[PDB]
Amino acid sequence: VNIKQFLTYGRLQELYCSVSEKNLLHTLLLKKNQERQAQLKFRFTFHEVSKVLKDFLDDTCKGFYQKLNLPDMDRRCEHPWRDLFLWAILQNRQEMANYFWAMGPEAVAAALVGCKIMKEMAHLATEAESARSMKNAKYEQFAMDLFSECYSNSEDRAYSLLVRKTCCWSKATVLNIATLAEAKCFFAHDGVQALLTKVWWGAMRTDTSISRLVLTFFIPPLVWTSLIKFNPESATFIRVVLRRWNRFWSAPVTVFMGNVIMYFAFLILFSYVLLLDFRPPPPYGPSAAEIILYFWVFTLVLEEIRQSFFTDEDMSILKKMKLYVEDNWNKCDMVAISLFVVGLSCRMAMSTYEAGRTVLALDFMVFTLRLIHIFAIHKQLGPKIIIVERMIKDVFFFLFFLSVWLIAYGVTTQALLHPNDPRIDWVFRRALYRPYLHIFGQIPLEEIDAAKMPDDNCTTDVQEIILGTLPPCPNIYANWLVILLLVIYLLVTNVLLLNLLIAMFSYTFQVVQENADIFWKFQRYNLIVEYHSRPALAPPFIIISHITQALLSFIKDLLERELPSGLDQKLMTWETVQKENYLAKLEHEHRESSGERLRYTSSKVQTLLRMVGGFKDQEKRM
Amino acid sequence: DMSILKKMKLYVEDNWNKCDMVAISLFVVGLSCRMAMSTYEAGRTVLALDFMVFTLRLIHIFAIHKQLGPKIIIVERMIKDVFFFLFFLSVWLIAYGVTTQALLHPNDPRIDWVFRRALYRPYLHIFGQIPLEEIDAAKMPDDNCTTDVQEIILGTLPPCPNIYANWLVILLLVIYLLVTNVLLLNLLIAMFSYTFQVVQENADIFWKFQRYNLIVEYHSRPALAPPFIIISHITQALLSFIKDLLERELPSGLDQKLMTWETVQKENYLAKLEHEHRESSGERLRYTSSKVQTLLRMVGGFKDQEKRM
Ligand SMILES: C[C@@H]1CC[C@@]2(OC1)O[C@H]1C[C@H]3[C@@H]4CC=C5C[C@@H](OCC[C@H](CO)CO[C@@H]6O[C@H](CO)[C@@H](O[C@H]7O[C@H](CO)[C@@H](O)[C@H](O)[C@H]7O)[C@H](O)[C@H]6O)CC[C@]5(C)[C@H]4CC[C@]3(C)[C@H]1[C@@H]2C
Ligand SMILES: C[C@@H]1CC[C@@]2(OC1)O[C@H]1C[C@H]3[C@@H]4CC=C5C[C@@H](OCC[C@H](CO)CO[C@@H]6O[C@H](CO)[C@@H](O[C@H]7O[C@H](CO)[C@@H](O)[C@H](O)[C@H]7O)[C@H](O)[C@H]6O)CC[C@]5(C)[C@H]4CC[C@]3(C)[C@H]1[C@@H]2C
Ligand SMILES: C[C@@H]1CC[C@@]2(OC1)O[C@H]1C[C@H]3[C@@H]4CC=C5C[C@@H](O)CC[C@]5(C)[C@H]4CC[C@]3(C)[C@H]1[C@@H]2C
Ligand SMILES: C[C@@H]1CC[C@@]2(OC1)O[C@H]1C[C@H]3[C@@H]4CC=C5C[C@@H](O)CC[C@]5(C)[C@H]4CC[C@]3(C)[C@H]1[C@@H]2C
Ligand SMILES: *[C@@H]1O[C@H](CO)[C@@H](O)[C@H](O)[C@H]1NC(C)=O
Ligand SMILES: *[C@@H]1O[C@H](CO)[C@@H](O)[C@H](O)[C@H]1NC(C)=O
Ligand SMILES: [Ca+2]
Ligand SMILES: [Ca+2]
Known part of the structure; x- marks a missing residue:
């Protein structure tokens, strides 16, 4: 059977129409068909398949079947193994999909696509057993093992395989598919x-010492010395010195260094303006340092705009905005920018001056916390960010129990101690703020224990309590009960509930620390990619880079590169050979396994018993 | 006798050696400053620090005991954990402290008090020092306070804390207490627990290496303890001018006998390894499958020959 001749588009559509109607793919195709019928022979059509694929990849299946819209039904599929693999993946058939992947040309990209589709469908997960089998798909492992084989083979063709635009997946890079699939273990591969x-070191050699690189950063003229080794490849002298300077000052590591230093400078200036040089409204004018801070934040806004609208290429504006706002650091920045703008606006008026100063203090808090993202560069600091995020989630869930318990205890103790205090603010103080402070050692027994209550001048008159002339007299009717409740609260909260939260923290830390390497390597990938696409200048100076880019656009890649047809075909054949070698080694390993040997021995012993019995009977005939 | 530079490099490679060097330098600087009236207090301060260094130097003798040795390694790794935790702690404390200083004392110009309220007070919150009389308006005393900047700088009266939005200051303090005191402190403690677990798994090996190092160190030391060690030093110098348990040179016959004995021991060890490998389950399975294959082929041939008859 020749699959190239066997699989026509009509045949493929017939296969898509022959879905068992008990698996998720049939339901999804039914929903697509119902939507199409509402908006406007074969039960299902390639339009439905394209829409279903769009709900899992949304960029990869660009005109897989919409190109001709519908293609000729007697025409053979241009990518038969790709189509068969996609069809066998959409319906949780993993063995068949494994076979189709083993016969397919671009196997790393196919495996990453399969892992993405498996996780998205396990998010859909109509059933639960299918969802569990689809959680353990092991396609990212196929991609990792094939790429390990490839990287061990050549280590130079592996990089090109990583960055080349694929032919079977609509010019999508393997790294692009891994990002779409969120394949953290693939990004943690040694080759990646x-x-x-x-990419991180750029023109310099990757073995460059940190001390030499920092010292050359702080002494720019030393870059023309041989202190920093660079990778191979009047007017000439100027050109070569400019080339050396640009190659050093364009490396993502130096851009990162400069951005970190200028962010420290920005925080220092922000703190100076907020704490020492915050002047009255424009009647007495913002200080010059404040205007410098305004310009700095304006350049930050320009950088945000560049990242959200003019990032790297041309897509839908809405798609680019969605990609921008999907990053949590991006929305953190947006919050910081909005807070700064609101603060500055309120500060410009006398009646909102204090509110503006307050909002600006909160904005400094947000910017300083934003500074945390640079810790992903270090193995010992990166994973701790993820730990802190998960631990914040743990705190959020613990807060339900804490709030219920504190409401009960605080209202009971407020009723027992100050039944005649009408003021709501003091009600909430004594009911929640004081019990919360008990957790951290703040136990004011002079307000709770009668024997410790001072002889202060106190009133029982409600009007005098509301007026605030004298503090209310605490009720000591049954003070033993108040003290017993405080003892119980101290035990329960401070030991039991606090250590329940701490045990949750410990479990979270243990779970993340088990996979610390993978998490940090994914973080490092994201940080390096972020600073590789950034302009070489740090804000405020980034205004120069923005102006230069705009002027270049008006007047007139390391990753995701397009290859010549011959080199592309050579790479595809090389990867196919590597996959064949990997599968052959897997088969050989399987054959020599203990279970396989046991099965072979038992079967052959059975055959030997039968044939030896026949031979013995024949001999006994003689 | 080696290269002088090699011996110095070997000396300074030991961390206890550089600890001692730090202690000696501190004592010398302290004594020198103490010799002058204008540097007397600085000399006393440096000598106090030197006592601290010497007392910590005393820790090295704990390697002699199995229950004390490994704890030194645990403490070193835990200090590294603290160093890495300090980045998060410093960033968080800078953010919180500057925000609260801006909210509470926007008119206080003095930088020392800025840094006090921005980092020293939040750090002390971690250890139960929560002065609500400076943060909560309802707990603020009726003390005699000024809003004049000149009077604040002069120090005549304490500055009046700003109570503009005190609910926000209190909410920030509540959030800081939760985040820092529970979350971040227990993140550091979980790091500590992991470090302790990793070292305690290999406690025996670490302590035995420590014991080796300590025994070797005190085997090569002169028999007299300082100050008295001056007598041993003078005796050694006099012996050098006028005129080993480990690393000993053997006669040629005994050396050859030892080499042959070790070769025989290695041969016995390798033979036992080979015998263990042969009788393993996997090897037996491989042998049985291969011989069953051979038996199938040869029995088929024999059966065909019999069927010829
Ligand atoms: C292992 C486990 C640990 C936890 C726990 O169980 C065991 O421990 C138990 C111990 C127990 C507690 C044991 C004892 C008591 C005392 C008892 O009061 C007796 C009531 C009498 C009558 O009403 C009040 O007396 C008098 O009051 C006056 C004030 O009103 C004081 O005058 C002061 O007045 C003013 C003070 O402002 C000022 O003029 C002066 O300062 C002074 O003149 C007198 O001096 C004092 O004599 C109340 C109960 C209490 C606190 C127990 C509570 C439960 C425990 C903590 C257990 C735990 C589960
Ligand atoms: C489970 C979880 C725990 C954590 C938390 O969430 C839930 O708990 C919540 C509880 C909440 C708090 C609940 C209540 C409040 C009170 C509120 O003030 C109301 C504002 C008004 C108006 O501006 C101020 O009032 C008045 O001020 C005056 C001082 O200025 C006082 O006069 C004093 O003046 C001088 C004091 O020097 C002296 O003359 C005397 O001593 C006295 O005359 C009055 O007596 C008082 O009436 C501010 C907010 C706060 C603290 C909440 C903050 C957030 C919580 C902790 C939640 C947690 C997330
Ligand atoms: C963590 C939750 C948030 C929401 C909440 O409980 C904790 O906060 C508390 C703070 C309370 C305020 C505190 C002070 C005052 C001033 C007083 O003159 C009138 C009542 C009012 C507004 C109170 C209304 C009820 C409020 C919002 C409580 C509310 C359930
Ligand atoms: C753990 C870090 C060490 C470094 C540092 O932050 C914590 O220490 C802080 C102590 C600060 C001092 C404290 C007191 C004074 C006296 C005052 O009249 C002038 C300013 C000055 C020197 C301050 C300058 C800034 C300093 C070094 C801060 C500096 C970022
Ligand atoms: C309490 O107020 C009354 C009002 O007359 C006064 O006489 C008395 O001295 C006050 N006591 C204290 C402790 O302030
Ligand atoms: C505060 O200082 C003024 C100066 O006249 C004085 O009259 C007043 O008694 C002082 N109050 C306190 C509480 O020291
Ligand atoms: Ca951003
Ligand atoms: Ca020494």
Whole structure:
């Protein structure tokens, strides 16, 4: 059977129409068909398949079947193994999909696509057993093992395989598909990390010492010395010195360094303006340092705009905005920008001056916390960010129990101690703020224990309590009960509930620390990619880079590169050979396994018993 | 006798050696400053720090005991954990402290008090020092306070804390207490627990290496303890001018006998390894499958020959 001749588009559509009607793919195709019928022979059509694929990849299946809209039904599929793999993946058939992947040309990209589709469908997950089998798909492992084989083979063709635009997946890069699939374990591969290190250092050699690089950063003229080794490849002298300077000052590591230093400078200036040089409204004018801070934040806004609208390429504006706002650091920045603008606006008026100063203090808090993202560069600091996020989630869930318990205890103690205090603010103080402070050692027994209550001048008159002339007299009717409740609260809260939260923290830390390497390598990938696409200048100076880019656009890649047809075909054949070698080694390993040997021995012993019995009977005939 | 530079490099490679060097330098600087009236207090301060260094130097003798040795390594790794935790702690404390200083004392110009309220007070919150009389308006005393900047700088009266939005200051303090005191402190403690677990898994090996190092260190030391060690030093110098348990040179016959004995021991060890490998389950399975294959082929041939008859 020749699959190239066997699989026509009509045949493929017939296969898509022959879905068992008990699996998720049939339901999804039914929903697509119902939507199409509402908006406007074969039960299902390639339009429905394209829409279903769009709900899992949304960029990869660009005109897989919409190109001709519908293609000729007697025409053979241009990518038969790709189509068969996609069809066998959409319906949770993993063995068949494994076979189709083993016969397919672009296997790393196919495996990453399969892992993405498996996780998205396990998010859909109509059933639960299918969802569990689809959680353990092991396609990212196929991609990782094939790429390990490829990287061990050549280590230079592996990088090109990482960055080349695929032919079977609509010019999508393997790294693009891994990002779409969120394949954290693939990004943690040694080959991917090596390519990331090569991108990180740019023109310099990756073995460059940190001390030499920092010292050359702080002494720019020393870059023309041989202190920093660079990778191979009047007017000439100027050109070569400019080339050396640009190659050093364009590397993502130096851009990162400069951005970190200028962010420290920005925080220092922000703190100076907020704490020492915050002047009255424009009647007495903002200080010059404040205007410098305004310009700095304006350049930050320009950088945000560049990242949200003019990032790297041309897509839908809405798609680019969605990609921008999907990053949590991006929305953190947006919050900081909005807070600064509101603060500045309120500060410009006398009646809102204090509110503006308050909002600006909160904005400094937000910017300083924003500074945290640079810790992903270090293995010992990166994973702790993820730990802190999960631990914040743990705190959020613990807060339900804490709030219920504190409401009960605080209202009971407020009723027992100050039944005649009408003021609501003091009700909430004594009911929640004081019990919360008990957790951290703040136990004011002079307000709770009668024997410790001072002889202060106190009133029982409600009007005098409301007026605030004298503090209310605490009720000591049954003070033993108040003290017993405080003892119980101290035990329960401070030991039991606090250590329940701490045990939750410990479990979270243990779970993240088990996978610390993978998490940090994914973080490092994201940080290196972020600073590789950034302009070489740090804000405020980034205004120069923005102006230069705009002027270049008006007047007139390391990753995701397009290859010549011959080199592309050579790479595809090389990867196919690597996949064949990997599968052959897997088969050989399987054959020599203990279970396989046991099965072979038992079967052959059975055959030997039968044939030896026959031979013995024949001999006994003689 | 080696290269002088090699011996110095070997000396300074030991951390206890550089600890001692720090202690000696501190004592010398302290004594020198103490010799002058204008540097007397600085000399006393440096000598106090030197006592601290010497007392911590005393820790090295704990390697002699199995229950004390490994704890030194645990403490070193835990200090590294603290160093890495300090980045998060410093960033968070800078954010919170500057925000609260701006909210509470926007008119206080003095930088020392800025840094006090921005980092020293939030750090002390971690250890139960929560002065609500400076943060909560309802707990603020009726003390005699000024809003004049000149009077604040002069120090005549304490500055009046700003109570503009005190609910926000209190909410920030509540959030800081939760985040820092529970979350971040227990993140550091979980790091500590992981470090302790990793070292305690290999406690025996670490302590035995420590014991080796300590025994070797005190085997090569002169028999007299300082100050008295001056007598041993003078005796050694006099012996050098006028005129080993480990690392000993053997006669040629005994050396050859030892080499042959070790070769025989290695041969016995390798033979036992080979015998263990042969009788393993996997090897037996491989042998049985291969011989069953051979038996199938040869029995088929024999059966065909019999069927010829
Ligand atoms: C292992 C486990 C640990 C936890 C726990 O169980 C065991 O421990 C138990 C111990 C127990 C507690 C044991 C004892 C008591 C005392 C008892 O009061 C007796 C009531 C009498 C009558 O009403 C009040 O007396 C008098 O009051 C006056 C004030 O009103 C004081 O005058 C002061 O007045 C003014 C003070 O402002 C000022 O003029 C002066 O300062 C002074 O003149 C007198 O001096 C004092 O004599 C109340 C109960 C209490 C606190 C127990 C509570 C429960 C425990 C904590 C257990 C735990 C589960
Ligand atoms: C489970 C979880 C725990 C954590 C938390 O969430 C839930 O708990 C919540 C509880 C909440 C708090 C609940 C209540 C409040 C009170 C509120 O003030 C109301 C504002 C008004 C108006 O501006 C001020 O009032 C008045 O001020 C005056 C001072 O200025 C006082 O006069 C004093 O003046 C001088 C004091 O020097 C002296 O003359 C005397 O001593 C006295 O005359 C009055 O007596 C008082 O009436 C501010 C907010 C706060 C603290 C909440 C903050 C957030 C919580 C902790 C929640 C947690 C997330
Ligand atoms: C963590 C939750 C948030 C929401 C909430 O409980 C904790 O906060 C508390 C703060 C309370 C305020 C505190 C002070 C005052 C001033 C007083 O003159 C009138 C009542 C009012 C507004 C109170 C109304 C009820 C409020 C919002 C409580 C509310 C359930
Ligand atoms: C753990 C870090 C060490 C470094 C540092 O932050 C914590 O220490 C802080 C102590 C600060 C001092 C404290 C007191 C004074 C006296 C005052 O009249 C002038 C300013 C000055 C020197 C301050 C300058 C800034 C300093 C070094 C801060 C500096 C970022
Ligand atoms: C309490 O107020 C009354 C009002 O007359 C006064 O006489 C008395 O001295 C006050 N006591 C204290 C402790 O302030
Ligand atoms: C505060 O200082 C003024 C100066 O006249 C004085 O009259 C007043 O008694 C002082 N109050 C306190 C509480 O020291
Ligand atoms: Ca951003
Ligand atoms: Ca020494």
